Design a protein around this nucleic acid. Structure first.
Ligand SMILES: [Mg+2]
Ligand SMILES: [Mg+2]
Ligand SMILES: [Mg+2]
Ligand SMILES: [Mg+2]
Ligand SMILES: [Mg+2]
Ligand SMILES: [Mg+2]
Ligand SMILES: [Mg+2]
Ligand SMILES: [Mg+2]
Ligand SMILES: [Mg+2]
Ligand SMILES: [Mg+2]
Ligand SMILES: [Mg+2]
Ligand SMILES: [Mg+2]
Ligand SMILES: [Mg+2]
Ligand SMILES: [Mg+2]
Ligand SMILES: [Mg+2]
Ligand SMILES: [Mg+2]
Ligand SMILES: [Mg+2]
Ligand SMILES: [Mg+2]
Ligand SMILES: [Mg+2]
Ligand SMILES: [Mg+2]
Ligand SMILES: [Mg+2]
Ligand SMILES: [Mg+2]
Ligand SMILES: [Mg+2]
Ligand SMILES: [Mg+2]
Ligand SMILES: [Mg+2]
Ligand SMILES: [Mg+2]
Ligand SMILES: [Mg+2]
Ligand SMILES: [Mg+2]
Ligand SMILES: [Mg+2]
Ligand SMILES: [Zn+2]
Ligand SMILES: [Zn+2]
Lengths: 25, 127, 202, 97, 91, 214, 93
RNA sequence: GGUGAAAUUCUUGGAUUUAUUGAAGACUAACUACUGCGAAAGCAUUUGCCAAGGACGUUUUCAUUAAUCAAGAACGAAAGUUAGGGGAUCGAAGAUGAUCAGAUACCGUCGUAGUCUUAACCAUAAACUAUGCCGACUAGGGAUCGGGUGGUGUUUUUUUAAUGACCCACUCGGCACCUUACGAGAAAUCAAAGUCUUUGGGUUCUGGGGGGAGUAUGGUCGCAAGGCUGAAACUUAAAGGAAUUG
């Protein structure tokens, strides 16, 4: 896949990762 | 040497316009040319049709009577293609030869000072 | 008290009696104490003065405009409001202007306005931040606060009253033909919903 | 500009700042010109103009408030009026003003 | 030493009502409270009270103005477009 | 058939004296019925007559010209001036690459209480003894020149009437009194006024408008 | 590797040049890189002159500058893609 | 009307077209170039004001006051965020008309945000010359920008100068281009990417096979979107670069 697409893919992946654990913050 | 009017011609892509009127421009004499005798919706700009309709145009011109007028022909312009169209010249081709004099000629295509950003975005039509 | 914009106590001489008459105007932003006010057709276009809508050019900003000549002022009186003159019909001597609402009305050129914009503008920009602030605000206007949601009452108290759940149970838009005791909600709503897209008047 | 022409008399000649001092000078005739700030009240202004007319003293209205007239003469306080007593080498008394 | 990093005057409201509301209040708060400069005397002696009313400590002068500032943007832009229209009816 | 041919009759214009030839030709507005007719709603137009057709030979064939219909009565609808303009052919033929353009305008008034925005266009001439193919001056000249063109342009439109004004720019010598000053600055070939456009006029003054015929 | 020393066209020492928009697809393109061709075409032309007053007084034409977005220029207009060393030739012909 | 062609669409409401004419916001065409300026971002109508700058010139002044720089700071395209105003244009979203097997698109249409401006943020671009800064040396060539010098050079003719523009030669500093290669390079190519195994002028910064991954973790900045800092377990024999032939 494209580079910038791989960027958005992980940027979103982190937003979810960040969200998923702020639950236990 | 005789009576004058105003040409008012317009050229597009897939359409053409031609119409006479009083020099003042207040009263309009006879205008419709675009897709009158041509009906495919593709041949609206075609030169054969431009002439076939320009015929009835000069027809009405003399139907009520006038000897000549000098053009004001222009292209859509504005922010779209800055250039004459196909059925623009092919009309007066059969209209100047239709037995009527011609004089002072000039373009009236509108053109700005680089503004009113065009359609299609920075990448334009993609094909 | 109970008004957002400040008022201006202006004294004048009585042309028919050695007496002084004190009129009460609405202070247009920029007016000051001891300032001189000129009123009349042949007055100068100076912020503070009051001139007929005929004696001013298009684009002028005026406040406390009269709907009819001499009604002593009826439009653009709330803090920071004004009306702009957008034209004159010297025949029937009308004058078309745009009000704060946005609508454009035409009135006689003899109507009077005051050059400028009403003082105290921007009040609504500050949040109230507490029930007490609004309580004190309405304390001087009227007994219109607080408001009970008609959906929290029993059917005997409101059209939206009742129900095992809090719901209007029927379209909240009411027709203009409605009768007193029925007109509760969005009356004669030509539309409804979150107003999206830009807006201004043509 | 003009501000420089006056800024010369401060370091060159004799002057007096203040409504009271410049009126004793105006009535004594020692003033050849007086500068009045923009924001100086009309009444005070006309009063000074009267004393000036009696002393045949000329006047100049500085286009700028007393705050500007003070920073103009190097002082760190407002100045409602200035009155020159000796323009050491300034051409203010002979310039267009 | 600096007492508050961001509340400023709005600290009186404590922790209630939300950042947004507090911050937006602090802005107009500073405006309606700070001392301004008087046009007729040159001193920084004009303060508010009874919003839309600005008075000078000395020289006892009052001017009608914005609810939280002496002059509101609109008012200023009107002063200008009223000066132009006036300048147009003498010459 | 409706046959608009059987409809209302023609009318004619002619130029203010202000020239050599004046016959415009003819128009057609409406027969003067009497309810809403050709008395109060006609003299609100303009026509595109060129000057080579107006006065002489083609040494005068580039300027466009407007003519605002002022008033009409019987065999009336004689028209005064409304402005002017150049023509695309010549302007686009004057603006050639490898040289700089200079354009300037000013809004001045006459004793004839009309003000107006004038235009001016000048270019750079390559001295007939030079080798450099671009022929460019450099921005002290541009400012100084447009300074002098406004200096001379605003000293001829207010020292006269709109009529004499026309009589002044028709000979076109304005084109070179600009060069009088320019000669000491830069070659400056192809110098013309290139346009005129306007706002208003003092209420009609029919008595003064009738001072252009005989 | 690069395949033009200019790597685009006519631009060294400015960092930026506001762009123009191509006439065919309306796609923007920096002015320094947009290919420019001035179209000067007359109105033509034998009978337009006989049955006419003004026996060929002026004969004016249409003057207009064209800019392409290059891919459109390549599609139709003069690109006529060249060879490695033939492209360095800046002769207009 | 719009296109390759169509269709959604607009037309008793006189549309598309014409004339006169007014409003609003945006933009600066053509002139425009291997042309200028700025630390970079970037900067093109006019005029007035405000301070600011390089090159030149200089038998003026000071006299080592400098070069480059962790930390730290100023600015910093576009989009994006907060509070007003603006909101004409074009226009993520979303809705549609068509095409397609399908078509969340490309083409068409409507149009939200946005696009503009003020106050405050955000600090990232293939922010590119994919090429650190100061110094010195090494090679030929005609253009051009600015300053300068030289002149019984041409033109303005006024009456010839003075001037202005122009020609020619030279010299500083610019933006390039051209030819060569001594020389360099893996090559493409390079007056630096040269004066290196005959290896040392001063100084700053980064890289050490490919993935993992700019991921995890901590710290910190931000309203948020996110920015700076930034691993490892494990996995893998290639991945890459320039050039040749197909
Ligand atoms: Mg893979
Ligand atoms: Mg939880
Ligand atoms: Mg669109
Ligand atoms: Mg293609
Ligand atoms: Mg109550
Ligand atoms: Mg409520
Ligand atoms: Mg409630
Ligand atoms: Mg209950
Ligand atoms: Mg009930
Ligand atoms: Mg009910
Ligand atoms: Mg209920
Ligand atoms: Mg509910
Ligand atoms: Mg490649
Ligand atoms: Mg570029
Ligand atoms: Mg860049
Ligand atoms: Mg321009
Ligand atoms: Mg919008
Ligand atoms: Mg969609
Ligand atoms: Mg579909
Ligand atoms: Mg979608
Ligand atoms: Mg980066
Ligand atoms: Mg680059
Ligand atoms: Mg290089
Ligand atoms: Mg790399
Ligand atoms: Mg980098
Ligand atoms: Mg060399
Ligand atoms: Mg010399
Ligand atoms: Mg080699
Ligand atoms: Mg070699
Ligand atoms: Zn005061
Ligand atoms: Zn294109």
């Amino acid at each position: 896949m494209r580079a910038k697409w791989r960027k958005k893919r992980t940027r979103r992946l982190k937003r979810k990762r960040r969200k998923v654990r702020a639950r236990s913050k | 040497s005789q009576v004058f009017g105003v040409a008012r011609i317009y050229a597009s892509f897939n359409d053409t316009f031609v119409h006479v009127t009083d020099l003042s421009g207040k009263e309009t004499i006879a205008r419709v040319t675009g897709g009158m005798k041509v009906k495919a919706d593709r041949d609206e700009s075609s030169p054969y049709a431009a002439m076939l309709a320009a015929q009835d145009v000069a027809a009405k011109c003399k139907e009520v009577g006038i000897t000549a007028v000098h053009v004001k022909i222009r292209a859509t312009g504005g922010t779209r293609t800055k250039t004459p169209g196909p059925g623009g010249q092919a009309a007066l081709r059969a209209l100047a030869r239709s037995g009527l004099r011609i004089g002072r000629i000039e373009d009236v295509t509108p053109v700005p000072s680089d503004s009113t950003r065009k359609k299609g975005g920075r990448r334009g039509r993609r094909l | 008290s109970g008004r957002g914009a400040p008022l201006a106590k202006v004294v004048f001489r009585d042309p028919y009696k050695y007496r002084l008459r004190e009129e009460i105007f609405i202070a247009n932003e920029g007016v000051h104490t001891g300032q001189f006010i000129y009123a009349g057709k042949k007055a100068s276009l100076n912020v503070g003065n009051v001139l007929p809508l005929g004696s001013v050019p298009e684009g002028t900003i005026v406040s406390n405009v009269e709907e009819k000549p001499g009604d002593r002022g009826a439009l653009a009186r709330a803090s920071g409001n004004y009306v702009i003159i957008i034209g004159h019909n010297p025949d029937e001597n009308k004058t078309r202007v745009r009000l704060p609402s946005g609508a454009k009305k035409v009135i006689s050129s003899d109507a009077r306005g005051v050059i400028g914009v009403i003082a105290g503008g921007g009040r609504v920009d500050k949040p109230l931040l507490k029930a007490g602030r609004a309580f004190h605000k309405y304390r001087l206007k009227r007994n219109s606060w607080p408001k009970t949601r008609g959906v929290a009452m029993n059917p005997v108290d409101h059209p939206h009253g009742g129900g095992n759940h809090q719901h209007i149970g029927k379209a909240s838009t009411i027709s203009r033909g409605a009768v007193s005791g029925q007109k509760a909600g969005l009356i004669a709503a030509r539309r409804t919903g979150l107003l999206r897209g830009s807006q201004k008047t043509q | 500009s003009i501000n420089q022409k006056l800024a010369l008399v401060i370091k060159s000649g004799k002057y007096t700042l203040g409504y009271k001092s410049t009126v004793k000078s105006l009535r004594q005739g020692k003033s050849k010109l007086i500068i009045i700030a923009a924001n100086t009240p009309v009444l005070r202004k006309s009063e000074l103009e009267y004393y000036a007319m009696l002393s045949k003293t000329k006047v100049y209205y500085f286009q700028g408030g007393n705050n500007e007239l003070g920073t103009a003469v190097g002082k760190l306080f407002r100045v409602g009026v200035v009155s020159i007593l000796e323009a050491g080498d300034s051409d203010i008394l002979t310039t267009l003003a | 030493a600096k007492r508050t990093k961001k509340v400023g005057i709005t600290g009186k409201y404590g922790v209630r009502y939300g950042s947004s509301l507090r911050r937006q209040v602090k802005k107009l708060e500073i405006q309606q409270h700070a001392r301004y400069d008087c046009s007729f005397c040159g001193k920084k002696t004009v303060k508010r009270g009874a919003a839309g009313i600005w008075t000078c400590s000395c020289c006892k002068k009052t001017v009608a103005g914005g609810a939280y500032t002496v002059s509101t943007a609109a008012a200023a832009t009107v002063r200008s477009t009223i000066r132009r229209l006036r300048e147009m009816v003498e010459a | 058939v409706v046959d608009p041919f059987t409809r209302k009759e023609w009318f004619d214009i002619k130029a203010p004296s202000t020239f050599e030839n004046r016959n415009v030709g003819k128009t057609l507005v409406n027969k003067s019925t009497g309810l809403k007719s050709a008395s109060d709603a006609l003299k609100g137009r303009v026509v595109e007559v060129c000057l080579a057709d107006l006065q002489g030979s083609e040494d005068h064939s580039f300027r466009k010209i407007k003519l605002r219909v002022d008033e009409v009565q019987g065999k009336n609808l004689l028209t005064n001036f409304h402005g002017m303009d150049f023509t695309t052919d010549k302007l686009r033929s004057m603006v050639r690459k490898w040289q700089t353009l200079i354009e300037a305008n000013v809004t001045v008034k006459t004793s004839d209480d009309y003000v107006l925005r004038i235009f001016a266009i000048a270019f750079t001439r390559k001295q007939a003894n030079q080798v450099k193919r671009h022929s460019y001056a450099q921005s002290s000249h541009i400012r100084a020149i447009r300074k002098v063109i406004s200096e001379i342009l605003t000293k001829e439109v207010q020292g006269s009437t709109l009529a004499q004004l026309t009589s002044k720019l028709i000979p076109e010598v304005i084109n070179k009194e600009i060069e009088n000053a320019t000669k000491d600055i830069f070659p400056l070939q192809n110098i013309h006024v290139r346009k005129v456009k306007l706002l208003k006029q003092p209420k009609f003054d029919v008595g003064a408008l009738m001072a252009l015929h005989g | 590797p690069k395949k033009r020393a200019s790597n685009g066209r006519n631009k060294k020492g400015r960092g930026h040049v506001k762009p123009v928009r191509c006439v065919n697809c309306s796609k923007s393109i920096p002015k320094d890189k947009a290919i420019k061709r001035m179209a000067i075409r007359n109105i033509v032309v034998r009978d337009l002159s006989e049955a006419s007053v003004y026996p060929e007084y002026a004969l004016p034409k249409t003057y207009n500058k064209l800019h392409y977005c290059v891919s459109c220029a390549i599609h139709a207009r003069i690109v006529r893609v060249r060879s490695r060393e033939d492209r360095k030739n800046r002769a207009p012909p």
